[PDB]
From a paper:
Cytochromes c' are soluble periplasmic heme proteins widely distributed among Gram-negative bacteria from psychrophiles to thermophiles. The vast majority of cytochromes c' consist of homodimeric subunits with each monomer forming either a four-α helix bundle or a β sheet structure, called cytochrome c'-α or cytochrome c'-β, respectively. Both types of cytochromes c' contain a penta-coordinate heme per subunit, in which the heme Fe binds to an endogenous conserved proximal His ligand and their distal sites are vacant. Cytochrome c' has an ability to bind diatomic gases such as nitric oxide (NO) through the heme in vitro, indicating possible cellular functions as NO sensor or scavenger.
Residue numbers in the entry:
A (entry chain A), B (entry chain A): 2 to 135
The structure:
């Protein structure tokens, strides 16, 4: 199976990959710091949905607490104490990510901006709660 | 725009995310060390295709040579000298990744194994050529 170090690397890599693709959508539909491209915004949305559906629950186990992947894990132990809250936030994130990829395929900038805002809220719902602040 | 350090982190994260998802397909259709799941193999294929289509060419510029992302970049300078060879290998990889996601949606283990083998060859075609060995 996967060593703890690999579980942490693979989840840090997955989240960092989503963050690159989230920044590209933000640049094109929120900040206008990149030209709007239907192809590029859809491609970025599709990465977020695919990773959201990739079964990242397999990368979460107690033996990953405090373990270095690319860097020391920022997972808080309360993740293992609050499984009802984790299920609520995770299922919400998958639903919002799926919707973003659906909207971004042919949606206009304002439709995408609305769906993107719901995904951003879903990402943020793990902050301070399950991820150590920095 | 993106600092060199961010370009290296985002490309290292993208490749590591594909490697996690490639390992899951290998376990289910090549080594039989994980139970075959149509849902899970399709989800893993969809991550690889989505990242392959994510425009990772934006993360490649000469000012990323020798720069630390998660770790010091393993990009070789000959990437910038061999753009015809890079275009051949990159377009091949996108084509094979798209085909893997198409096959993995309803394909059987042997169909997926064949498409997965073509993607593995496409990943390997950047080795020693554009990525430093270790
Ligand atoms: C809880 C169910 C989460 C959801 C939904 C998202 N993230 Fe997250 N993120 C979470 C944890 C517990 C951690 C720490 C991982 C570790 O082991 O250290 C993170 C981390 C990140 C990071 C930093 C990654 C790194 O290289 O170290 C980023 C950039 C990040 N997360 C972004 C992010 C985005 C963009 C999300 C929505 C698309 C998202 N996360 C969801 C917990 C959760
Ligand atoms: C050339 C067009 C590439 C293709 C196609 C793939 N990879 Fe690759 N990979 C490449 C470079 C130039 C590098 C170095 C990146 C850097 O800046 O250091 C890599 C790196 C990886 C890594 C290590 C990532 C890390 O955390 O440091 C892995 C695990 C990796 N690559 C895997 C991989 C897979 C599975 C691919 C096909 C699905 C794949 N790569 C394609 C160049 C190229
Ligand atoms: O590191 C971070 O991860 C999340 C996500 O938004 C990534 O962009 C966040 O809010 C950060 O500053
Ligand atoms: O606007 C954004 O919100 C998401 C989310 O991660 C918020 O934390 C993200 O990374 C963006 O670019
Ligand atoms: O790295 C960060 O730490 C805090 C917190 O959200 C982490 O959970 C924050 O807002 C960041 O961007
Ligand atoms: O680090 C590696 O990256 C490629 C890829 O196969 C990832 O699994 C490879 O062959 C490695 O050992
Ligand atoms: O069998 C595999 O091949 C790919 C490719 O990266 C080969 O280098 C990979 O990572 C696998 O699990
Ligand atoms: O890390 C590795 O270095 C060599 C080379 O392929 C890198 O380009 C190899 O086969 C690995 O798995």
């Amino acid at each position: 199976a996967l060593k703890p170090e690999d579980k942490v690397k693979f989840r840090q890599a997955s989240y960092t990959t989503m963050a690159w693709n989230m920044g590209k959508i933000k640049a094109m539909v929120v900040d206008g710091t990149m030209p709007f491209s239907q192809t590029q915004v859809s491609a970025a949305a599709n990465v977020i949905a695919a990773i959201a559906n990739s079964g990242m629950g397999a990368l979460y186990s107690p033996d990953t607490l405090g373990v270095v992947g690319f860097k020391k894990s920022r997972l808080k132990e309360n993740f293992f104490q609050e499984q009802d809250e984790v299920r609520k936030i995770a299922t919400n994130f998958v639903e919002q990510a799926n919707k973003l990829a659906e909207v971004a395929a042919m949606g206009d900038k304002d439709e995408i901006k609305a769906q993107f805002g719901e995904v951003g809220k879903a990402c943020k719902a793990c902050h301070e709660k399950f991820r150590e602040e920095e």
